[model samples]
Target: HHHHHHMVHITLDRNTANSWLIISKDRRQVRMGDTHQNVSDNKERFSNYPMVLGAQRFSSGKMYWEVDVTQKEAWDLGVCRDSVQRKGQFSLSPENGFWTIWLWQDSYEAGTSPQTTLHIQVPPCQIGIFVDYEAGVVSFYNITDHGSLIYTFSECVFAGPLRPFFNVGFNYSGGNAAPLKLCPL
Candidate 1:
Protein backbone atom coordinates (compact mmCIF):
# COMPACT_ATOMS: atom_id res chain seq x y z
CA HIS A 1 0.00 0.00 0.00
CA HIS A 2 1.19 3.48 -0.72
CA HIS A 3 1.46 5.56 2.46
CA HIS A 4 0.24 9.15 2.28
CA HIS A 5 1.23 12.34 4.08
CA HIS A 6 -0.22 15.86 4.01
CA MET A 7 0.16 19.42 5.31
CA VAL A 8 -2.83 21.77 5.10
CA HIS A 9 -2.39 25.48 5.88
CA ILE A 10 -4.76 28.38 5.39
CA THR A 11 -3.39 31.82 4.50
CA LEU A 12 -5.25 34.96 5.50
CA ASP A 13 -4.40 37.87 3.25
CA ARG A 14 -6.00 41.24 2.63
CA ASN A 15 -7.83 40.16 -0.50
CA THR A 16 -8.28 36.51 0.44
CA ALA A 17 -8.85 35.09 3.92
CA ASN A 18 -9.77 31.56 2.86
CA SER A 19 -6.67 29.92 1.44
CA TRP A 20 -6.10 26.14 2.02
CA LEU A 21 -3.52 23.43 1.27
CA ILE A 22 -3.82 19.64 0.55
CA ILE A 23 -1.23 16.91 -0.09
CA SER A 24 -1.44 13.16 -0.63
CA LYS A 25 0.60 10.06 -1.52
CA ASP A 26 -1.89 8.52 -3.90
CA ARG A 27 -4.56 9.17 -6.51
CA ARG A 28 -7.77 11.09 -5.69
CA GLN A 29 -5.45 13.45 -3.87
CA VAL A 30 -7.58 16.59 -3.63
CA ARG A 31 -11.22 17.13 -2.77
CA MET A 32 -13.64 19.86 -1.51
CA GLY A 33 -16.88 18.44 -0.12
CA ASP A 34 -19.93 20.03 1.51
CA THR A 35 -20.78 20.66 5.19
CA HIS A 36 -24.00 18.73 5.62
CA GLN A 37 -25.24 16.85 8.70
CA ASN A 38 -26.40 13.77 6.85
CA VAL A 39 -23.57 11.43 5.94
CA SER A 40 -25.39 10.73 2.67
CA ASP A 41 -24.85 14.37 1.75
CA ASN A 42 -21.14 13.58 1.46
CA LYS A 43 -20.31 16.83 3.21
CA GLU A 44 -17.14 17.07 5.26
CA ARG A 45 -17.51 17.25 9.08
CA PHE A 46 -15.87 20.00 11.14
CA SER A 47 -14.07 19.65 14.49
CA ASN A 48 -15.28 21.26 17.75
CA TYR A 49 -11.97 22.62 18.83
CA PRO A 50 -11.27 26.37 18.63
CA MET A 51 -10.48 27.90 15.21
CA VAL A 52 -9.92 24.89 12.99
CA LEU A 53 -11.40 23.97 9.63
CA GLY A 54 -13.60 20.97 8.75
CA ALA A 55 -12.57 17.53 7.57
CA GLN A 56 -10.29 16.74 4.58
CA ARG A 57 -8.90 13.64 2.86
CA PHE A 58 -5.46 12.16 2.26
CA SER A 59 -6.29 8.79 0.72
CA SER A 60 -3.09 6.97 1.54
CA GLY A 61 -3.08 7.46 5.29
CA LYS A 62 -6.09 5.43 6.45
CA MET A 63 -6.70 8.20 8.97
CA TYR A 64 -9.33 10.90 9.50
CA TRP A 65 -8.59 14.48 10.65
CA GLU A 66 -11.24 16.55 12.42
CA VAL A 67 -11.75 19.37 14.95
CA ASP A 68 -13.53 17.10 17.53
CA VAL A 69 -16.21 19.13 19.21
CA THR A 70 -18.90 19.05 21.91
CA GLN A 71 -21.56 21.00 20.00
CA LYS A 72 -24.58 19.41 18.37
CA GLU A 73 -24.63 21.76 15.39
CA ALA A 74 -22.23 21.39 12.48
CA TRP A 75 -20.68 24.89 12.48
CA ASP A 76 -19.66 24.84 16.15
CA LEU A 77 -16.66 22.56 15.63
CA GLY A 78 -13.12 23.84 15.48
CA VAL A 79 -9.78 21.96 15.17
CA CYS A 80 -9.10 18.29 15.92
CA ARG A 81 -6.20 18.68 18.28
CA ASP A 82 -5.63 15.39 20.13
CA SER A 83 -7.28 11.97 19.85
CA VAL A 84 -9.96 12.26 22.50
CA GLN A 85 -13.64 12.80 21.70
CA ARG A 86 -15.81 14.84 24.13
CA LYS A 87 -19.28 14.66 22.65
CA GLY A 88 -22.27 16.67 23.93
CA GLN A 89 -20.00 18.92 25.99
CA PHE A 90 -20.22 22.70 25.71
CA SER A 91 -17.38 25.17 26.01
CA LEU A 92 -17.08 26.91 29.35
CA SER A 93 -16.29 30.34 27.92
CA PRO A 94 -17.57 31.65 24.60
CA GLU A 95 -14.26 33.25 23.70
CA ASN A 96 -12.00 30.56 25.20
CA GLY A 97 -13.34 27.05 24.92
CA PHE A 98 -11.98 23.56 25.54
CA TRP A 99 -10.56 23.30 22.03
CA THR A 100 -7.84 20.85 21.07
CA ILE A 101 -6.24 19.07 18.07
CA TRP A 102 -6.96 15.37 17.61
CA LEU A 103 -5.99 12.31 15.48
CA TRP A 104 -8.20 9.31 14.84
CA GLN A 105 -6.77 5.97 13.83
CA ASP A 106 -10.01 4.82 12.32
CA SER A 107 -12.96 7.24 12.80
CA TYR A 108 -13.62 9.91 15.42
CA GLU A 109 -13.22 7.74 18.53
CA ALA A 110 -12.23 8.65 22.06
CA GLY A 111 -9.09 7.47 23.95
CA THR A 112 -5.86 8.10 22.12
CA SER A 113 -2.43 9.55 22.83
CA PRO A 114 -0.45 12.81 22.47
CA GLN A 115 -3.49 15.04 23.07
CA THR A 116 -3.57 18.50 24.62
CA THR A 117 -6.18 21.21 25.23
CA LEU A 118 -4.87 24.37 23.59
CA HIS A 119 -5.69 27.93 24.70
CA ILE A 120 -5.70 30.28 21.72
CA GLN A 121 -7.96 32.80 20.16
CA VAL A 122 -10.04 31.66 17.21
CA PRO A 123 -9.60 34.89 15.31
CA PRO A 124 -12.14 35.84 12.69
CA CYS A 125 -9.30 36.57 10.28
CA GLN A 126 -6.93 33.78 11.30
CA ILE A 127 -5.59 30.64 9.62
CA GLY A 128 -6.38 26.93 10.36
CA ILE A 129 -4.42 23.90 9.22
CA PHE A 130 -4.04 20.05 9.31
CA VAL A 131 -1.28 17.50 8.75
CA ASP A 132 -0.67 13.72 8.87
CA TYR A 133 2.36 11.59 9.69
CA GLU A 134 5.90 12.84 10.31
CA ALA A 135 5.17 15.06 13.34
CA GLY A 136 4.70 18.61 12.05
CA VAL A 137 3.64 22.01 13.37
CA VAL A 138 1.25 24.69 12.06
CA SER A 139 2.26 28.33 12.44
CA PHE A 140 0.36 31.58 11.96
CA TYR A 141 1.62 34.60 10.06
CA ASN A 142 0.82 38.30 9.97
CA ILE A 143 1.95 39.48 6.58
CA THR A 144 0.96 41.36 3.46
CA ASP A 145 0.49 39.74 0.03
CA HIS A 146 4.23 39.00 0.11
CA GLY A 147 3.84 36.54 3.05
CA SER A 148 5.77 37.38 6.18
CA LEU A 149 5.57 35.71 9.58
CA ILE A 150 4.53 38.26 12.13
CA TYR A 151 3.76 35.50 14.69
CA THR A 152 3.65 31.70 14.71
CA PHE A 153 2.21 29.04 17.03
CA SER A 154 4.39 28.70 20.09
CA GLU A 155 3.23 25.11 20.74
CA CYS A 156 3.53 22.03 18.50
CA VAL A 157 2.65 18.31 18.64
CA PHE A 158 2.53 15.02 16.72
CA ALA A 159 -0.45 14.70 14.35
CA GLY A 160 -0.25 11.14 13.10
CA PRO A 161 1.85 8.50 11.45
CA LEU A 162 2.04 8.13 7.67
CA ARG A 163 -0.71 5.82 6.42
CA PRO A 164 -1.70 4.40 3.07
CA PHE A 165 -4.79 6.62 3.12
CA PHE A 166 -6.23 9.21 5.49
CA ASN A 167 -8.74 12.05 5.70
CA VAL A 168 -8.09 15.49 7.22
CA GLY A 169 -11.03 17.59 8.41
CA PHE A 170 -12.31 20.54 10.49
CA ASN A 171 -15.38 20.73 12.75
CA TYR A 172 -17.13 24.05 13.39
CA SER A 173 -18.75 24.09 16.84
CA GLY A 174 -19.60 27.77 16.59
CA GLY A 175 -22.06 29.63 14.35
CA ASN A 176 -19.34 31.19 12.21
CA ALA A 177 -18.92 29.45 8.87
CA ALA A 178 -15.56 29.30 7.09
CA PRO A 179 -13.74 27.33 4.37
CA LEU A 180 -10.27 25.75 4.43
CA LYS A 181 -7.32 25.66 1.97
CA LEU A 182 -5.00 22.58 1.91
CA CYS A 183 -1.37 22.54 0.74
CA PRO A 184 1.68 20.22 0.89
CA LEU A 185 4.69 21.01 3.08
Candidate 2:
Protein backbone atom coordinates (compact mmCIF):
# COMPACT_ATOMS: atom_id res chain seq x y z
CA HIS A 1 0.00 0.00 0.00
CA HIS A 2 1.27 3.50 -0.83
CA HIS A 3 1.33 5.53 2.34
CA HIS A 4 2.52 8.78 0.82
CA HIS A 5 -0.61 9.34 -1.20
CA HIS A 6 -3.93 9.20 0.55
CA MET A 7 -6.99 7.57 -0.98
CA VAL A 8 -9.70 9.44 -2.83
CA HIS A 9 -13.23 8.14 -3.52
CA ILE A 10 -15.06 9.21 -6.63
CA THR A 11 -18.44 8.63 -8.21
CA LEU A 12 -19.98 8.67 -11.67
CA ASP A 13 -21.79 11.64 -13.14
CA ARG A 14 -25.02 10.59 -14.86
CA ASN A 15 -25.00 13.21 -17.63
CA THR A 16 -21.41 12.50 -18.62
CA ALA A 17 -22.11 8.82 -19.20
CA ASN A 18 -22.34 7.92 -22.85
CA SER A 19 -25.73 6.52 -23.68
CA TRP A 20 -24.03 3.30 -24.80
CA LEU A 21 -22.16 3.04 -21.52
CA ILE A 22 -23.64 1.12 -18.61
CA ILE A 23 -22.64 2.38 -15.18
CA SER A 24 -22.73 -0.17 -12.38
CA LYS A 25 -25.51 0.14 -9.81
CA ASP A 26 -22.94 1.04 -7.18
CA ARG A 27 -21.42 3.60 -9.61
CA ARG A 28 -17.97 2.17 -9.12
CA GLN A 29 -17.80 0.13 -12.32
CA VAL A 30 -18.29 1.24 -15.87
CA ARG A 31 -18.66 -1.04 -18.86
CA MET A 32 -19.76 -1.25 -22.43
CA GLY A 33 -23.51 -1.61 -22.62
CA ASP A 34 -24.84 -5.16 -23.03
CA THR A 35 -25.94 -3.86 -26.40
CA HIS A 36 -25.56 -0.36 -27.71
CA GLN A 37 -28.56 1.77 -26.91
CA ASN A 38 -29.97 4.44 -29.23
CA VAL A 39 -30.67 6.79 -26.40
CA SER A 40 -29.63 10.18 -27.79
CA ASP A 41 -28.16 11.92 -30.77
CA ASN A 42 -24.45 12.42 -30.11
CA LYS A 43 -24.76 12.16 -26.34
CA GLU A 44 -21.08 11.41 -26.66
CA ARG A 45 -19.48 9.45 -29.43
CA PHE A 46 -16.11 9.07 -31.08
CA SER A 47 -16.80 12.62 -32.20
CA ASN A 48 -16.35 14.06 -28.71
CA TYR A 49 -16.38 13.40 -24.93
CA PRO A 50 -15.94 9.65 -25.25
CA MET A 51 -15.87 8.89 -21.53
CA VAL A 52 -17.57 9.74 -18.22
CA LEU A 53 -16.29 12.03 -15.46
CA GLY A 54 -16.21 11.37 -11.73
CA ALA A 55 -18.34 13.42 -9.40
CA GLN A 56 -15.64 14.13 -6.84
CA ARG A 57 -13.05 16.84 -7.36
CA PHE A 58 -9.66 17.60 -5.86
CA SER A 59 -8.18 21.07 -5.78
CA SER A 60 -5.03 20.28 -3.90
CA GLY A 61 -3.34 17.33 -2.19
CA LYS A 62 -1.49 14.10 -2.84
CA MET A 63 -4.10 11.66 -4.04
CA TYR A 64 -4.10 8.03 -5.13
CA TRP A 65 -6.67 5.67 -6.60
CA GLU A 66 -6.81 2.33 -8.39
CA VAL A 67 -8.85 0.72 -11.10
CA ASP A 68 -9.31 -2.90 -12.18
CA VAL A 69 -9.07 -2.82 -15.93
CA THR A 70 -8.78 -6.59 -16.30
CA GLN A 71 -12.22 -6.86 -17.84
CA LYS A 72 -11.92 -4.21 -20.51
CA GLU A 73 -10.21 -4.33 -23.89
CA ALA A 74 -10.12 -0.59 -24.45
CA TRP A 75 -9.80 2.23 -21.95
CA ASP A 76 -8.98 5.88 -21.21
CA LEU A 77 -8.33 6.75 -17.59
CA GLY A 78 -6.97 9.81 -15.86
CA VAL A 79 -7.98 13.24 -14.55
CA CYS A 80 -8.83 16.71 -15.76
CA ARG A 81 -9.68 20.01 -14.15
CA ASP A 82 -13.27 21.18 -13.93
CA SER A 83 -12.62 23.92 -16.45
CA VAL A 84 -12.06 21.37 -19.16
CA GLN A 85 -14.43 21.92 -22.03
CA ARG A 86 -17.09 19.22 -22.22
CA LYS A 87 -19.07 20.67 -25.04
CA GLY A 88 -19.39 19.63 -28.69
CA GLN A 89 -15.82 18.51 -29.42
CA PHE A 90 -12.45 18.37 -27.71
CA SER A 91 -9.28 16.28 -27.62
CA LEU A 92 -7.74 14.69 -24.56
CA SER A 93 -4.38 16.36 -24.19
CA PRO A 94 -2.38 18.46 -21.79
CA GLU A 95 -3.24 21.40 -24.01
CA ASN A 96 -6.87 20.53 -23.44
CA GLY A 97 -6.84 20.12 -19.68
CA PHE A 98 -6.67 16.29 -19.80
CA TRP A 99 -3.86 14.15 -18.51
CA THR A 100 -4.61 10.56 -19.42
CA ILE A 101 -3.39 7.22 -20.73
CA TRP A 102 -5.26 4.96 -23.05
CA LEU A 103 -5.41 1.32 -24.04
CA TRP A 104 -6.57 0.99 -27.60
CA GLN A 105 -7.49 -2.43 -28.83
CA ASP A 106 -4.66 -3.78 -26.64
CA SER A 107 -1.76 -1.33 -26.90
CA TYR A 108 -1.00 1.17 -24.17
CA GLU A 109 -0.62 4.74 -25.39
CA ALA A 110 0.04 7.90 -23.45
CA GLY A 111 -2.86 10.20 -24.23
CA THR A 112 -0.82 13.27 -25.14
CA SER A 113 -1.07 15.83 -27.91
CA PRO A 114 1.09 13.56 -29.98
CA GLN A 115 0.40 10.16 -28.50
CA THR A 116 3.46 8.43 -27.06
CA THR A 117 3.81 4.73 -27.75
CA LEU A 118 4.55 2.48 -24.79
CA HIS A 119 6.19 -0.93 -24.92
CA ILE A 120 4.45 -2.92 -22.20
CA GLN A 121 5.22 -6.63 -22.52
CA VAL A 122 2.41 -7.66 -20.20
CA PRO A 123 -0.21 -5.15 -19.10
CA PRO A 124 -1.27 -5.10 -15.48
CA CYS A 125 -4.69 -6.20 -14.27
CA GLN A 126 -4.79 -3.17 -12.00
CA ILE A 127 -3.53 0.36 -12.48
CA GLY A 128 -2.65 2.90 -9.80
CA ILE A 129 -2.74 6.64 -10.24
CA PHE A 130 -1.12 9.32 -8.14
CA VAL A 131 -1.39 13.07 -8.40
CA ASP A 132 0.30 15.93 -6.61
CA TYR A 133 -1.18 19.32 -7.23
CA GLU A 134 1.67 21.45 -5.91
CA ALA A 135 4.25 19.37 -7.75
CA GLY A 136 2.19 19.45 -10.91
CA VAL A 137 2.54 15.73 -11.60
CA VAL A 138 0.28 12.83 -12.42
CA SER A 139 1.86 9.39 -12.56
CA PHE A 140 0.61 6.00 -13.66
CA TYR A 141 1.72 2.62 -12.41
CA ASN A 142 1.18 -1.01 -13.29
CA ILE A 143 0.18 -2.13 -9.80
CA THR A 144 -0.57 -5.83 -10.14
CA ASP A 145 3.05 -7.07 -10.37
CA HIS A 146 4.65 -4.57 -8.05
CA GLY A 147 4.70 -0.89 -8.87
CA SER A 148 6.14 -0.31 -12.33
CA LEU A 149 6.08 3.09 -13.97
CA ILE A 150 3.82 3.17 -16.99
CA TYR A 151 3.83 6.92 -17.69
CA THR A 152 3.72 10.29 -16.02
CA PHE A 153 2.29 13.67 -16.97
CA SER A 154 4.67 16.28 -15.67
CA GLU A 155 4.21 20.04 -15.29
CA CYS A 156 0.48 19.71 -15.01
CA VAL A 157 -0.83 23.18 -14.15
CA PHE A 158 -4.02 22.37 -12.33
CA ALA A 159 -6.18 25.49 -12.42
CA GLY A 160 -9.04 24.31 -10.23
CA PRO A 161 -10.77 21.15 -9.08
CA LEU A 162 -9.43 18.08 -10.82
CA ARG A 163 -11.65 15.01 -11.06
CA PRO A 164 -11.58 11.40 -12.19
CA PHE A 165 -12.17 10.35 -15.77
CA PHE A 166 -12.62 7.03 -17.56
CA ASN A 167 -13.52 5.44 -20.83
CA VAL A 168 -14.62 1.80 -21.12
CA GLY A 169 -15.42 1.48 -24.77
CA PHE A 170 -14.97 -1.21 -27.42
CA ASN A 171 -16.75 -2.85 -30.25
CA TYR A 172 -19.49 -5.26 -29.19
CA SER A 173 -18.58 -8.14 -31.55
CA GLY A 174 -14.88 -7.59 -31.03
CA GLY A 175 -14.76 -9.57 -27.79
CA ASN A 176 -13.88 -6.33 -25.98
CA ALA A 177 -16.97 -5.96 -23.86
CA ALA A 178 -16.17 -5.65 -20.17
CA PRO A 179 -16.15 -3.33 -17.18
CA LEU A 180 -13.55 -0.93 -15.82
CA LYS A 181 -14.30 -1.23 -12.13
CA LEU A 182 -13.04 1.33 -9.62
CA CYS A 183 -11.58 -0.42 -6.65
CA PRO A 184 -12.24 0.82 -3.11
CA LEU A 185 -9.55 2.94 -1.58
Candidate 3:
Protein backbone atom coordinates (compact mmCIF):
# COMPACT_ATOMS: atom_id res chain seq x y z
CA HIS A 1 0.00 0.00 0.00
CA HIS A 2 1.26 3.47 -0.90
CA HIS A 3 0.51 6.66 0.99
CA HIS A 4 0.95 10.07 -0.69
CA HIS A 5 -1.07 12.97 0.65
CA HIS A 6 -2.93 14.01 3.76
CA MET A 7 -6.59 13.06 3.98
CA VAL A 8 -9.03 15.93 3.78
CA HIS A 9 -12.20 16.62 5.71
CA ILE A 10 -15.08 16.63 3.25
CA THR A 11 -18.70 17.45 3.92
CA LEU A 12 -21.60 17.04 1.53
CA ASP A 13 -23.18 20.14 0.10
CA ARG A 14 -26.78 19.82 1.25
CA ASN A 15 -27.97 22.39 -1.30
CA THR A 16 -26.73 20.21 -4.15
CA ALA A 17 -28.26 17.00 -2.92
CA ASN A 18 -31.40 15.46 -4.38
CA SER A 19 -34.47 15.92 -2.28
CA TRP A 20 -34.84 12.19 -1.77
CA LEU A 21 -31.46 12.07 -0.03
CA ILE A 22 -31.39 12.55 3.71
CA ILE A 23 -28.28 14.47 4.70
CA SER A 24 -27.27 14.33 8.32
CA LYS A 25 -27.30 17.52 10.38
CA ASP A 26 -23.52 17.55 10.30
CA ARG A 27 -23.49 17.25 6.49
CA ARG A 28 -20.99 14.42 6.76
CA GLN A 29 -23.44 11.60 6.11
CA VAL A 30 -26.17 10.80 3.62
CA ARG A 31 -28.71 8.09 2.90
CA MET A 32 -31.51 7.50 0.44
CA GLY A 33 -34.98 8.32 1.73
CA ASP A 34 -38.28 6.72 0.73
CA THR A 35 -39.91 10.03 -0.02
CA HIS A 36 -38.68 13.30 -1.44
CA GLN A 37 -38.48 16.20 0.97
CA ASN A 38 -39.25 19.88 0.39
CA VAL A 39 -36.29 21.48 -1.39
CA SER A 40 -36.17 24.14 -4.02
CA ASP A 41 -35.78 23.02 -7.62
CA ASN A 42 -32.86 25.34 -8.08
CA LYS A 43 -29.85 25.08 -10.39
CA GLU A 44 -27.60 23.59 -7.75
CA ARG A 45 -29.93 20.85 -6.52
CA PHE A 46 -30.12 17.50 -8.19
CA SER A 47 -33.62 17.19 -9.62
CA ASN A 48 -33.55 13.49 -10.45
CA TYR A 49 -30.34 11.80 -9.37
CA PRO A 50 -29.95 10.67 -5.80
CA MET A 51 -26.55 12.28 -5.42
CA VAL A 52 -24.58 15.00 -3.63
CA LEU A 53 -21.33 16.92 -4.06
CA GLY A 54 -18.75 17.99 -1.52
CA ALA A 55 -19.07 21.47 -0.17
CA GLN A 56 -15.45 22.23 -1.07
CA ARG A 57 -14.17 22.41 -4.64
CA PHE A 58 -10.63 21.62 -5.73
CA SER A 59 -8.94 23.32 -8.64
CA SER A 60 -5.47 21.88 -8.41
CA GLY A 61 -4.08 19.73 -5.63
CA LYS A 62 -3.49 16.22 -4.38
CA MET A 63 -5.92 15.29 -1.64
CA TYR A 64 -7.49 12.24 -0.08
CA TRP A 65 -10.68 11.45 1.83
CA GLU A 66 -12.42 8.34 3.12
CA VAL A 67 -16.07 7.33 2.99
CA ASP A 68 -17.55 4.76 5.32
CA VAL A 69 -19.90 2.50 3.40
CA THR A 70 -20.12 -0.25 5.96
CA GLN A 71 -22.74 -2.79 4.91
CA LYS A 72 -23.99 -0.62 2.08
CA GLU A 73 -25.17 -2.82 -0.77
CA ALA A 74 -24.94 -0.03 -3.31
CA TRP A 75 -23.08 3.28 -3.35
CA ASP A 76 -20.92 5.49 -5.58
CA LEU A 77 -17.92 7.64 -4.66
CA GLY A 78 -15.42 9.77 -6.56
CA VAL A 79 -14.97 13.24 -8.00
CA CYS A 80 -16.90 15.26 -10.57
CA ARG A 81 -16.63 18.60 -12.28
CA ASP A 82 -18.58 21.31 -10.56
CA SER A 83 -20.79 21.71 -13.62
CA VAL A 84 -21.69 18.04 -13.91
CA GLN A 85 -25.20 17.34 -15.13
CA ARG A 86 -27.66 17.83 -12.31
CA LYS A 87 -30.89 16.90 -14.11
CA GLY A 88 -32.30 14.19 -16.37
CA GLN A 89 -31.11 10.61 -16.69
CA PHE A 90 -27.34 10.33 -16.60
CA SER A 91 -25.00 7.54 -15.65
CA LEU A 92 -21.83 7.96 -13.61
CA SER A 93 -19.01 8.02 -16.16
CA PRO A 94 -15.95 10.16 -16.82
CA GLU A 95 -17.54 11.15 -20.10
CA ASN A 96 -20.42 12.51 -18.05
CA GLY A 97 -18.09 14.72 -15.99
CA PHE A 98 -17.70 12.10 -13.23
CA TRP A 99 -14.80 9.83 -12.42
CA THR A 100 -16.48 7.38 -10.05
CA ILE A 101 -16.56 3.81 -8.82
CA TRP A 102 -19.54 1.93 -7.45
CA LEU A 103 -20.55 -1.17 -5.54
CA TRP A 104 -23.66 -3.21 -6.18
CA GLN A 105 -23.85 -6.25 -3.98
CA ASP A 106 -20.86 -8.44 -4.88
CA SER A 107 -19.94 -6.39 -7.92
CA TYR A 108 -17.61 -3.39 -7.95
CA GLU A 109 -16.83 -1.30 -11.02
CA ALA A 110 -15.14 1.88 -12.11
CA GLY A 111 -17.00 4.47 -14.16
CA THR A 112 -14.59 4.56 -17.06
CA SER A 113 -15.45 5.18 -20.71
CA PRO A 114 -16.01 1.46 -20.97
CA GLN A 115 -16.80 0.43 -17.41
CA THR A 116 -14.01 -1.47 -15.66
CA THR A 117 -15.02 -4.38 -13.48
CA LEU A 118 -13.21 -4.94 -10.17
CA HIS A 119 -12.61 -8.21 -8.33
CA ILE A 120 -12.25 -7.67 -4.62
CA GLN A 121 -12.03 -10.68 -2.31
CA VAL A 122 -12.82 -8.58 0.74
CA PRO A 123 -15.51 -5.95 0.43
CA PRO A 124 -14.24 -2.68 1.84
CA CYS A 125 -16.13 -1.18 4.75
CA GLN A 126 -14.50 2.17 4.11
CA ILE A 127 -13.15 3.50 0.80
CA GLY A 128 -10.54 6.18 0.24
CA ILE A 129 -10.51 8.52 -2.73
CA PHE A 130 -7.30 10.22 -3.80
CA VAL A 131 -7.26 12.91 -6.42
CA ASP A 132 -4.37 14.69 -8.11
CA TYR A 133 -6.12 17.39 -10.06
CA GLU A 134 -3.17 18.80 -11.96
CA ALA A 135 -1.90 15.31 -12.62
CA GLY A 136 -5.26 14.39 -14.12
CA VAL A 137 -5.79 11.36 -11.98
CA VAL A 138 -8.33 10.01 -9.49
CA SER A 139 -7.77 6.84 -7.51
CA PHE A 140 -9.88 4.74 -5.17
CA TYR A 141 -8.42 2.73 -2.33
CA ASN A 142 -9.89 0.04 -0.12
CA ILE A 143 -9.09 1.52 3.25
CA THR A 144 -10.37 -1.53 5.08
CA ASP A 145 -7.89 -3.69 3.15
CA HIS A 146 -4.71 -1.98 4.26
CA GLY A 147 -5.18 0.74 1.65
CA SER A 148 -5.13 -1.44 -1.42
CA LEU A 149 -5.70 0.23 -4.74
CA ILE A 150 -9.20 -0.45 -5.98
CA TYR A 151 -9.08 1.54 -9.25
CA THR A 152 -7.77 4.71 -10.80
CA PHE A 153 -8.91 7.09 -13.54
CA SER A 154 -6.06 8.79 -15.37
CA GLU A 155 -5.78 11.35 -18.14
CA CYS A 156 -8.90 13.02 -16.82
CA VAL A 157 -9.78 16.33 -18.44
CA PHE A 158 -11.31 18.38 -15.66
CA ALA A 159 -12.77 21.54 -17.17
CA GLY A 160 -13.86 23.17 -13.95
CA PRO A 161 -13.19 22.79 -10.27
CA LEU A 162 -13.86 19.26 -9.11
CA ARG A 163 -15.98 18.34 -6.14
CA PRO A 164 -16.19 15.07 -4.27
CA PHE A 165 -19.19 13.12 -5.58
CA PHE A 166 -21.40 10.63 -3.81
CA ASN A 167 -24.48 8.51 -4.49
CA VAL A 168 -26.13 6.58 -1.70
CA GLY A 169 -27.89 4.07 -3.91
CA PHE A 170 -31.65 3.97 -4.00
CA ASN A 171 -33.23 2.04 -1.16
CA TYR A 172 -34.84 -0.85 -2.96
CA SER A 173 -36.94 -3.01 -0.64
CA GLY A 174 -34.88 -1.46 2.15
CA GLY A 175 -31.84 -3.42 1.04
CA ASN A 176 -29.59 -0.39 0.55
CA ALA A 177 -30.64 1.89 3.34
CA ALA A 178 -27.26 2.20 5.06
CA PRO A 179 -25.80 5.68 5.10
CA LEU A 180 -22.61 6.71 3.31
CA LYS A 181 -20.48 8.66 5.76
CA LEU A 182 -17.53 10.99 5.23
CA CYS A 183 -14.87 9.76 7.57
CA PRO A 184 -13.49 12.45 9.83
CA LEU A 185 -9.71 12.70 9.88
lDDT of 3 by residue, 125-170 (tens): 9998899888999988888888888997888998899999998887
For each candidate in the order shown, give its overall lDDT on alpha carbons: 0.26, 0.78, 0.87
Off by over 4 Å in 2: 1-5, 34-50
Best by TM-score: 3
Per-model clash counts, in order, read 57, 0, 0
lDDT of 1 by residue, 80-103 (tens): 332223233333221222223222
Range of the 10 consecutive residues with the lowest summed lDDT in candidate 3: 1-10
Model 2 scores worst on lDDT over the 10 consecutive residues at: 41-50
Candidate ranking under TM-score, highest first, comes to 3, 2, 1
Candidate 3 residue runs with Cα over 4 Å from true position: 2-5
Better TM-score candidate (1, 2)? 2
Candidate 3: residue 180 Cα off by (Å) = 0.4
Q: Give the TM-score (vs. native) of candidate 3.
A: 0.95
The TM-score values for the models, in the order shown, are 0.29, 0.86, 0.95
